[PDB]
Amino acid sequence: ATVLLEVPFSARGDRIPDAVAELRTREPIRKVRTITGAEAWLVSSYALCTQVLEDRRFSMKETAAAGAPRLNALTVPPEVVNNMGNIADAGLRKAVMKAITPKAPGLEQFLRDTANSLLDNLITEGAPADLRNDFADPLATALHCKVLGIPQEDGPKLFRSLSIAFMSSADPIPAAKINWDRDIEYMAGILENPNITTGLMGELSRLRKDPAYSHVSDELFATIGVTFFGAGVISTGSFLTTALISLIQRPQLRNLLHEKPELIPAGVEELLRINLSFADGLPRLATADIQVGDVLVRKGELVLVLLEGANFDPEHFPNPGSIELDRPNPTSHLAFGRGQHFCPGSALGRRHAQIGIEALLKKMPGVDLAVPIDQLVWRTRFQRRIPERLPVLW
Ligand code: HEM
């Protein structure tokens, strides 16, 4: 006898397990057990993943309900699971989007200058260089301090909450509450700081004193700063790091993008499509009995939308494991989700990766791993798949 199939399958972000294609072909919706011991429905085909993400009766908000089957323990207060919904209800959605667009004056130049300075420092120090700790993550942190309008010197401390805040744990994490409360106090101070007049926090500070937003809570304003810094920095730093591995493992593509940097945006879209940065399926709780393929999902059950299940589906993306720059449906992947909860930082994440890759290929055209690929150490029980260090030479 064997136990019910457990998720996640592997923390490695450099290869997709053969099990994904097996489940997609044989049982594209099937029962699994999560790290908490709960049962869930794992969805692995493009058609069924899109159906779940486009039906709001599969609720993100309701995954925080007490007594629900859980993918993992909350690392934020339960109301914060519905963060975007709370922002929209407060009439702040348009202002938040305008603040996080990569089109802001001087933002792209700031990204280029920061990426170039980090790379120059690595070249001065000499090989090996760690592209996660000394490139991708500081570039993501610097970008988010600029987008938020907060001091660059405050970035490293806010960043150090992330290795705990984005854990995917069976049980509550005491350190996550200590760091959450401290980071909220910091953002509350930023709202009261007269020097903070630019970026997302400068805009929220002004809207907070506008009569049209007098009843929006101070708790929500501080929460927007903590959540957008954390989600943006963990997502951009982790995606860029794993996209750099995908590129280093494809020297023909690396050489083509070095030669023709105008192809970098199409290259980043394929790197997003094949990305294995999300460690778990996206969770949703059914609020009704809903038919998904051969399964009638019952009200109160947990559904997990496996992004790599959809993104590597050959019925939607033929030769799914290959980076092809001329696909006819290039942005139809689910790397940023789909539907009600589609990533609000999609344009900024694309620009962060495009500029980081453009700068790296110009400065280090001979970039290569400095250790055999199996020697990368993959972070476990985390909401993202990332190597602890990414040692390279050039
Ligand atoms: C490469 C970069 C990024 C990737 C791959 C990524 C991916 C995703 C995905 C897949 C979702 C959907 C989650 C779901 O439906 O359960 C999401 C949501 C979200 N992301 Fe991103 N993200 C990235 C960058 C960012 C950035 C830069 C920010 C903010 C500065 C951000 C803020 C958020 C927030 C707040 C949500 C929740 C939206 C909602 O509930 O409506 N993301 N992201």
Ligand SMILES: O=C1N[C@@H](Cc2c[nH]c3ccccc23)C(=O)N[C@H]1Cc1ccc(O)cc1
């Ligand atoms: O469940 C998630 N799902 C995805 C999407 C998401 C869902 N709800 C969110 C609220 C705020 C920011 C992001 C989200 C994610 O990026 N993060 C986590 C939420 C999160 C946010 C901030 C933390 O310190 C810890 C956890």
